[PDB]
Coordinates of C-alpha atoms in Angstrom, one line a residue:
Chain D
X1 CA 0.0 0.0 0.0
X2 CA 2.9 2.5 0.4
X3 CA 3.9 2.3 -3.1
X4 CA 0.9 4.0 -4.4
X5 CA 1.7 6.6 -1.6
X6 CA 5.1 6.8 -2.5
X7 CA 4.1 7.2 -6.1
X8 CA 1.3 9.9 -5.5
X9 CA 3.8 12.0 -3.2
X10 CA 6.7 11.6 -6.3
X11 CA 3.9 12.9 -9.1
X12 CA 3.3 15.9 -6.8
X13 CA 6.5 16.7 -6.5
X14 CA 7.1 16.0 -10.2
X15 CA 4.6 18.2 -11.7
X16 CA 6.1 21.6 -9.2
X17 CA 8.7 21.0 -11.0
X18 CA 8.0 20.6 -14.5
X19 CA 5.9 23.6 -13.5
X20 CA 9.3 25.4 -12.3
X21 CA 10.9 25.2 -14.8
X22 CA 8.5 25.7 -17.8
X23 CA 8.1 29.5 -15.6
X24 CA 11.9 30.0 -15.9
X25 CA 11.9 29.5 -19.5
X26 CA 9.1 31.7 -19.7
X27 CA 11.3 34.5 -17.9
X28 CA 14.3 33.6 -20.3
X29 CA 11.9 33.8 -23.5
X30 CA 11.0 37.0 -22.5
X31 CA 14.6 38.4 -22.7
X32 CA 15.0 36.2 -25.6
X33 CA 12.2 38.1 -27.4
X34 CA 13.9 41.5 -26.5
X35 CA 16.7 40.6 -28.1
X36 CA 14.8 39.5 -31.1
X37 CA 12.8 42.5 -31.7
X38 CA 16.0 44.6 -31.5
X39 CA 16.6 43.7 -34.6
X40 CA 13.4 44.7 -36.0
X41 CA 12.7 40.9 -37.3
X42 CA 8.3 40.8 -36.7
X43 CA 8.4 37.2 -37.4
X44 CA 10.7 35.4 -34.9
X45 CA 9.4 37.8 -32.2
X46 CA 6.0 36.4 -33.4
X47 CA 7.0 32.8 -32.5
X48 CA 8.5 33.8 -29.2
X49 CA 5.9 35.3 -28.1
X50 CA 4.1 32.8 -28.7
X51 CA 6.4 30.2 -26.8
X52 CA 6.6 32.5 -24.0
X53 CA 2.5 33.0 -23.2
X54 CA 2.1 28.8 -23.9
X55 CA 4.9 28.8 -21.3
X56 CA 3.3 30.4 -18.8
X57 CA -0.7 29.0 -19.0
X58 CA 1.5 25.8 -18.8
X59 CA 2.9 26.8 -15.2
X60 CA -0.6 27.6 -14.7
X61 CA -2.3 24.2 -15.8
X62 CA 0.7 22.0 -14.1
X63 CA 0.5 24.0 -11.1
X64 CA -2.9 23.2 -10.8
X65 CA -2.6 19.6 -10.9
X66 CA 0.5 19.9 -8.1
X67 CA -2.1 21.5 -5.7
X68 CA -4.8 18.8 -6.3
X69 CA -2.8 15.7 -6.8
X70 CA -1.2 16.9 -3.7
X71 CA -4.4 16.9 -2.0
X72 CA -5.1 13.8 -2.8
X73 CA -1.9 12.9 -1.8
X74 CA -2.2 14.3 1.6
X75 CA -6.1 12.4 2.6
X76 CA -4.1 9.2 1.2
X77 CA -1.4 9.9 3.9
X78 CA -3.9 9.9 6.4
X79 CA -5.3 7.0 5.6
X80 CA -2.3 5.0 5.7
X81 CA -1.3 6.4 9.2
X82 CA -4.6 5.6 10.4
X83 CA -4.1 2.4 9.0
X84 CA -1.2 1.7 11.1
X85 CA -2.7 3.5 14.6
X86 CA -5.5 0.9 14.2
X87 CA -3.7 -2.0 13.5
X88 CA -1.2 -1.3 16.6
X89 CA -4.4 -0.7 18.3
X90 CA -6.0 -3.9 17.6
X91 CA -2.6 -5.6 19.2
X92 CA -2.9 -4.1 22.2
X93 CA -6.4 -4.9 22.9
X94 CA -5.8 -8.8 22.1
X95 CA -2.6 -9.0 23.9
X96 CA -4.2 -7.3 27.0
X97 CA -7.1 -8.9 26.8
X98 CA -5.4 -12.8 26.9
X99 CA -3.3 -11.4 29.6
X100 CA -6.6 -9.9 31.0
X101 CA -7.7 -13.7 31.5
X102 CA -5.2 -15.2 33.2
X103 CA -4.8 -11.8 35.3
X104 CA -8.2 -11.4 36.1
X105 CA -9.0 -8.8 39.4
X106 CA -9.6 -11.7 42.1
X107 CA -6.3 -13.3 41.3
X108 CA -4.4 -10.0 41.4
X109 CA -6.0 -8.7 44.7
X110 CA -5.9 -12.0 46.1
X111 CA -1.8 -11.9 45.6
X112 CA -1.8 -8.7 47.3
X113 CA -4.0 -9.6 50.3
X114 CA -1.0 -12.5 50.3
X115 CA 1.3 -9.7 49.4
X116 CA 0.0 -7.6 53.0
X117 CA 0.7 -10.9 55.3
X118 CA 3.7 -11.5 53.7
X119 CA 5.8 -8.3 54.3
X120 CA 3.7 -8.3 57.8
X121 CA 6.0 -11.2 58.6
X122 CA 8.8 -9.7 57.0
X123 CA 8.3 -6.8 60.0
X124 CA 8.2 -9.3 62.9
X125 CA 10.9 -11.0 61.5
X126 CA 13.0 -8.1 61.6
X127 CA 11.8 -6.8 64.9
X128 CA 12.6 -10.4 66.7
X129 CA 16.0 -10.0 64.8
X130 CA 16.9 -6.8 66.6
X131 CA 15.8 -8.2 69.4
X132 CA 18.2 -11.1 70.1
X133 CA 20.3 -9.1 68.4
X134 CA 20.0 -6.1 70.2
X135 CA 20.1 -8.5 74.1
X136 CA 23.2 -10.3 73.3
X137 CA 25.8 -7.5 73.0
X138 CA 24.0 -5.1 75.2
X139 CA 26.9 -5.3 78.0
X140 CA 29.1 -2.9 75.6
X141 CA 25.7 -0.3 76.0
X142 CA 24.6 0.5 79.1
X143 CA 21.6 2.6 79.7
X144 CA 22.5 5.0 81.7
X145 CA 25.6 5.7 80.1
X146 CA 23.7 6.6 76.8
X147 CA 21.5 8.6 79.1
X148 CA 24.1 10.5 80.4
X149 CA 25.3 11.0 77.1
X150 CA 22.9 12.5 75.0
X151 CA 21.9 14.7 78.1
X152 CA 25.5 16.0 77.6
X153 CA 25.0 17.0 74.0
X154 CA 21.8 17.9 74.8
X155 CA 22.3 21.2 77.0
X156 CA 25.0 22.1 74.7
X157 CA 23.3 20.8 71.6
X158 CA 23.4 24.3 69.5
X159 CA 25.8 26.0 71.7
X160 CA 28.7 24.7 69.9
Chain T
X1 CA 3.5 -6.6 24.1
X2 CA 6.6 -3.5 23.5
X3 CA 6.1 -3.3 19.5
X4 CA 2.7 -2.1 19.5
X5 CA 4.0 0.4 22.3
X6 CA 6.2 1.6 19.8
X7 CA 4.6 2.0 16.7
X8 CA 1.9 3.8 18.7
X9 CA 5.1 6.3 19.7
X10 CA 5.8 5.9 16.3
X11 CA 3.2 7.3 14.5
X12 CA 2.6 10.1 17.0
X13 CA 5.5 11.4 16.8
X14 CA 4.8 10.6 12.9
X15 CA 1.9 12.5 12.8
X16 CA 3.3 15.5 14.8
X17 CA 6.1 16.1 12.2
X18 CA 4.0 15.9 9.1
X19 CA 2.1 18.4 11.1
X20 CA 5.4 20.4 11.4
X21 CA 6.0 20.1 7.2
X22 CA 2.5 21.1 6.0
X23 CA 2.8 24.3 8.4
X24 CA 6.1 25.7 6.9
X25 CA 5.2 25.2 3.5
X26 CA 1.9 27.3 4.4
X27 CA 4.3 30.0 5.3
X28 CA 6.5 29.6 2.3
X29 CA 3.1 29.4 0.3
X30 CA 2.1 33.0 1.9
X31 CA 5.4 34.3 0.4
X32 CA 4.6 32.6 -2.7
X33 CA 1.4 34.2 -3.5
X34 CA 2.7 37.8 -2.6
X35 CA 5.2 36.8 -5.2
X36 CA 2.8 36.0 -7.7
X37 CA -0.2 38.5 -6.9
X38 CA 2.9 41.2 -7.7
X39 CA 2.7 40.7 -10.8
X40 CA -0.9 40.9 -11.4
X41 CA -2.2 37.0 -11.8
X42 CA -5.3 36.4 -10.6
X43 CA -5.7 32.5 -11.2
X44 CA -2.6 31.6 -10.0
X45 CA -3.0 33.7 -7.4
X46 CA -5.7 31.5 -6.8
X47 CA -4.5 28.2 -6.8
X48 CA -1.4 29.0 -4.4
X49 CA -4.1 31.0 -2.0
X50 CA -6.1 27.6 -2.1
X51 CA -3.1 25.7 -1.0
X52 CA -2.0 27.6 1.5
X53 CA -5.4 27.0 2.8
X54 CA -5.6 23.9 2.6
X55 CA -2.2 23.6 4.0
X56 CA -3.2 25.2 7.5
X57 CA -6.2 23.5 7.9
X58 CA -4.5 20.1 7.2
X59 CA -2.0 21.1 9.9
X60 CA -5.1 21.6 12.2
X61 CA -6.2 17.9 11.8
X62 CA -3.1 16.1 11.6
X63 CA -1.8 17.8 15.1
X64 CA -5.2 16.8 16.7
X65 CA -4.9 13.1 15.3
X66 CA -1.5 13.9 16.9
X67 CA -3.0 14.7 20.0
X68 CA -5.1 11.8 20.9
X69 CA -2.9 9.2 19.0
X70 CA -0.6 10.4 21.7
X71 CA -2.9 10.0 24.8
X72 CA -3.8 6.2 24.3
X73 CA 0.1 6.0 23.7
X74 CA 0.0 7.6 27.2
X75 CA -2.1 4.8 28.9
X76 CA -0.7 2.0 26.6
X77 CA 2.5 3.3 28.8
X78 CA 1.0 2.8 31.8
X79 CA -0.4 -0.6 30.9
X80 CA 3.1 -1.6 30.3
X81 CA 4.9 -0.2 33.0
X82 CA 2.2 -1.5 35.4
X83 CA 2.5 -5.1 33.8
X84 CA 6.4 -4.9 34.5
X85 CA 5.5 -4.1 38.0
X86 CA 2.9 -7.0 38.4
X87 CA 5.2 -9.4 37.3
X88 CA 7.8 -8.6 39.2
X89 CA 5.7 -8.0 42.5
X90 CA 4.4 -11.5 42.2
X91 CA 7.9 -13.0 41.9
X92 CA 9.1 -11.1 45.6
X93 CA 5.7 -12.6 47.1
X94 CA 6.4 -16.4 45.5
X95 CA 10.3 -16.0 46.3
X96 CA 9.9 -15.1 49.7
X97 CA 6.9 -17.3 50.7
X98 CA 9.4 -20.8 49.5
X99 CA 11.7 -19.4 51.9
X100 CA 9.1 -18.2 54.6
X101 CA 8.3 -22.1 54.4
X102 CA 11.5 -23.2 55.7
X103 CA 12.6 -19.9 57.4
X104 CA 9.3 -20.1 59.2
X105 CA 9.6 -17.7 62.7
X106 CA 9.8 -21.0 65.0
X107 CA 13.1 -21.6 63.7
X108 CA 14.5 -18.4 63.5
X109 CA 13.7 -17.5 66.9
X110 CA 15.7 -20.5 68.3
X111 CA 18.4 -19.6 66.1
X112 CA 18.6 -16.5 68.1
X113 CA 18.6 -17.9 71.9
X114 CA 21.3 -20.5 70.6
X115 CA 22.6 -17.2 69.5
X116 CA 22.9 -15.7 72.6
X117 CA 24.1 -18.5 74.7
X118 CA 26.3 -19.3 72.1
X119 CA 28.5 -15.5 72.1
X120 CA 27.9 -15.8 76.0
X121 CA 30.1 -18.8 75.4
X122 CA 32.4 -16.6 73.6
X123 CA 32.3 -13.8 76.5
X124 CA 33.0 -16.4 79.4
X125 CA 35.9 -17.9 77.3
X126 CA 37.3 -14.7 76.9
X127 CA 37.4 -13.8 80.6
X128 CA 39.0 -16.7 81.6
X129 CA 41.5 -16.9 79.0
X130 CA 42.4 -13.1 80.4
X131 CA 43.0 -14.6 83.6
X132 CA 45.5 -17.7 83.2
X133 CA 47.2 -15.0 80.6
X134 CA 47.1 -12.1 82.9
X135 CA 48.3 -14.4 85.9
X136 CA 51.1 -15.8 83.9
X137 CA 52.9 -13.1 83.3
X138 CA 52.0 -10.8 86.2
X139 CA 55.9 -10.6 87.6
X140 CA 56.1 -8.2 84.9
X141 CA 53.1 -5.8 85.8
X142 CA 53.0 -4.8 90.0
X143 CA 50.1 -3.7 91.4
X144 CA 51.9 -1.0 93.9
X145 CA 53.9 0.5 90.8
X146 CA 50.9 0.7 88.6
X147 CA 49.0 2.5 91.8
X148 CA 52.1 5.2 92.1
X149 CA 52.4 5.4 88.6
X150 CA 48.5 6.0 87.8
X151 CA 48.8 8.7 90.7
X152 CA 52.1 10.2 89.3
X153 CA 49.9 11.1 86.1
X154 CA 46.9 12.0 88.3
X155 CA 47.5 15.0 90.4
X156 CA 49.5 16.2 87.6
X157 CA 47.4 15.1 84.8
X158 CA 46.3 18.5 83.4
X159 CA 49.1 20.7 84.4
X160 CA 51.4 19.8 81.4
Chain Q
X1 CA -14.2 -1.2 14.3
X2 CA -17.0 0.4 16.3
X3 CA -16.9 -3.0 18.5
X4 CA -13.5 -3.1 18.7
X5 CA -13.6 -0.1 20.5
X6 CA -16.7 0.1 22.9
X7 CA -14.4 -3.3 23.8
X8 CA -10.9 -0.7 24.1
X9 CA -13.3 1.4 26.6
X10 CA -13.9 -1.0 28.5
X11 CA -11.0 -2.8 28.3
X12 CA -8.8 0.2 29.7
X13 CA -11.3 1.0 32.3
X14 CA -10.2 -2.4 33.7
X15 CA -7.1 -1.1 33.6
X16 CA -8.0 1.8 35.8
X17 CA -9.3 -0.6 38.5
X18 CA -6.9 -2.9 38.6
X19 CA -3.9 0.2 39.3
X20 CA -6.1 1.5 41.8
X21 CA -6.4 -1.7 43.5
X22 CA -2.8 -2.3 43.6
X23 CA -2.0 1.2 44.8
X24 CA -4.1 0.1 47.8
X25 CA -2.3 -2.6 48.8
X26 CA 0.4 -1.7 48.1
X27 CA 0.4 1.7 49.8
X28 CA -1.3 0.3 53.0
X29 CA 1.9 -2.0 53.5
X30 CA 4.4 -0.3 54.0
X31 CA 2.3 2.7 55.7
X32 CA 3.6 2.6 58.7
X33 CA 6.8 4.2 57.1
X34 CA 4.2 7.0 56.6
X35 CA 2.1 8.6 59.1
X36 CA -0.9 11.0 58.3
X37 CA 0.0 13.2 61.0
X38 CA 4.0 13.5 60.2
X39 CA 2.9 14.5 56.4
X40 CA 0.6 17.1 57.9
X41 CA 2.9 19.1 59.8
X42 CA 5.6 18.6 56.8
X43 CA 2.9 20.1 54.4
X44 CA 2.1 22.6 56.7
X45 CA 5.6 23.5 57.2
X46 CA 6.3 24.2 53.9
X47 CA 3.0 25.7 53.3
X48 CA 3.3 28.8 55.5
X49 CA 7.0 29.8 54.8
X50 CA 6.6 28.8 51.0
X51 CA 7.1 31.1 49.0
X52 CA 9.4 32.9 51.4
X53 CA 13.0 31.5 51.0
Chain F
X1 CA 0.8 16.3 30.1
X2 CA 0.2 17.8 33.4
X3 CA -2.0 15.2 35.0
X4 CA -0.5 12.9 33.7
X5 CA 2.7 14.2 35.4
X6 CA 1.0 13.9 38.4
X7 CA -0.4 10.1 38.0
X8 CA 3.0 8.9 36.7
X9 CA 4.9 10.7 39.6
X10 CA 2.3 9.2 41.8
X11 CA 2.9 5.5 40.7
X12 CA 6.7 6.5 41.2
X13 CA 6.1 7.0 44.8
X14 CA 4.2 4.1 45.6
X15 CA 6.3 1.8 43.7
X16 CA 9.4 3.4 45.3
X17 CA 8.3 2.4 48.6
X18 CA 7.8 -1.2 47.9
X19 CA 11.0 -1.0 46.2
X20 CA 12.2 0.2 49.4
X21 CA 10.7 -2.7 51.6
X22 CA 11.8 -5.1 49.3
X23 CA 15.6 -3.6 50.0
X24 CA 15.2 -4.1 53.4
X25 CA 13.9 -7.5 52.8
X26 CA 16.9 -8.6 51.0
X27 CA 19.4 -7.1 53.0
X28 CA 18.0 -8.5 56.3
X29 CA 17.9 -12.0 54.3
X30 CA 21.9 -11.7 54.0
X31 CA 22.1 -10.7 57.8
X32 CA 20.1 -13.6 58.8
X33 CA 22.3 -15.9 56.7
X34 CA 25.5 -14.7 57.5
X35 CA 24.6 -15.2 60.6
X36 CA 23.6 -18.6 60.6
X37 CA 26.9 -19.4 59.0
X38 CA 28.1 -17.8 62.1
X39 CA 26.3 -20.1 64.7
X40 CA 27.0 -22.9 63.1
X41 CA 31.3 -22.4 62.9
X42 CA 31.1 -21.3 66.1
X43 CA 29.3 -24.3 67.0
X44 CA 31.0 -26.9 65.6
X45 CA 34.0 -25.4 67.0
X46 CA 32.4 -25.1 69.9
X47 CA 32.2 -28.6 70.3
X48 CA 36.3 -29.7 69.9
X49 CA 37.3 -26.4 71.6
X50 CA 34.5 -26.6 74.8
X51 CA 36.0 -24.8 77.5
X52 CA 37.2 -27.5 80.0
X53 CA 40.0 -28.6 77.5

């Protein structure tokens, strides 16, 4: 389906500039038929004068097509990206919707009931930890030293 | 599940820079048609007015497909990212439960009185190895020359 | 199409739920880390002297 | 792209903490095997080196 995109975009851009450059001749024709009437010849400024008007109702016509063709070109554009946005789209909804099976609510909140009891065990553990822990080198920290201590940097605390 | 993600980005971003084009040819189109209308055409005038038009209100729709493309790639983000984290949730909860089977609190808590009685082990040995060594060599070490020493440095501790 | 997306509406909205859910749980675990009344006077504290430097 | 800078950011908090609680999971399961380890060594050298001998 791109191709005919690609090949719409590429006759656009052709026919600006076929249009181009028939408008340049037309500017160069017109010098060309000064020079041609210097002379005085009414013939070959006849036929340049010619060549130069069917020059320019030529950028006109070509032009013309540029601006629809490009139109054309442009809805086609949007139909491919649209293409692709629904497509993508469509994926996403399957994918999520088989994983929206097996995922279902009641299994999810279920693992996160599990998921509160767990970590609530995770806390005790950690508390007994520090416990024992915290009873079997407590000779090295007495109480009332520590009290005495952070009285000590207490009065003084900001006093520096 | 990541490849639709990305096409989605994809074609907003996509959409958001064809956006971009057809607004700076509309301002190279306003340039055009002074250009043209300078030299007295009125059709092609015309045709370039029409484009520029249509050119501008082109940029209009494509920036709003822009928009809302961009918003379900938004939640599609979301959906992702909260996947990642259900996964991964549920593996901490299944990891940790097979070892809160066998690292169930019963066990753990023993672990912890054998811990203590075991370092209280470690204390007592210490102390009595600190005797037989202390009382070995003890010829070397006084008590009345440490008691005159220790005073020595007492009353004149802080005079220097 | 028109299916295919009454089915995306829905099919996000689940979505929805199912974060919310989680955020839940998962914000009432570990909320002992963080108290109502502690995040009041934080607030608060940077709510009188805010714009004041 | 505001509110949405507000949900995302939100998600990023709560998903922090359990990030968080997780850490401290971890960590505390290297502690209480280390420690283990510890008992045990101790132990079984408790055994040869018990403090008569």
């Amino acid at each position: 389906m791109e191709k005919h995109l690609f090949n719409l975009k590429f006759a656009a851009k052709e026919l600006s500039r076929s249009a181009k450059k028939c408008d340049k001749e037309e500017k160069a024709e017109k010098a060309k038929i000064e020079k041609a009437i210097q002379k005085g010849n009414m013939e070959v400024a006849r036929i340049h004068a010619e060549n130069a008007i069917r020059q320019k109702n030529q950028a006109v016509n070509f032009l013309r097509m540029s601006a629809r063709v490009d139109a054309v070109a442009a809805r086609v554009q949007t139909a491919v990206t649209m293409g692709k946005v629904t497509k993508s789209m469509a994926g996403v909804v399957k994918s999520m919707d088989a994983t929206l099976k097996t995922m279902n609510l009641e299994k999810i909140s279920a693992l996160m009931d599990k998921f509160e009891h767990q970590f609530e065990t995770l806390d005790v553990q950690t508390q007994q930890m520090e416990d024992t822990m915290s009873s079997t080198t407590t000779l090295t920290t007495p109480q009332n030293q520590v009290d005495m201590l952070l009285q000590e940097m207490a009065d003084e605390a900001g006093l520096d």
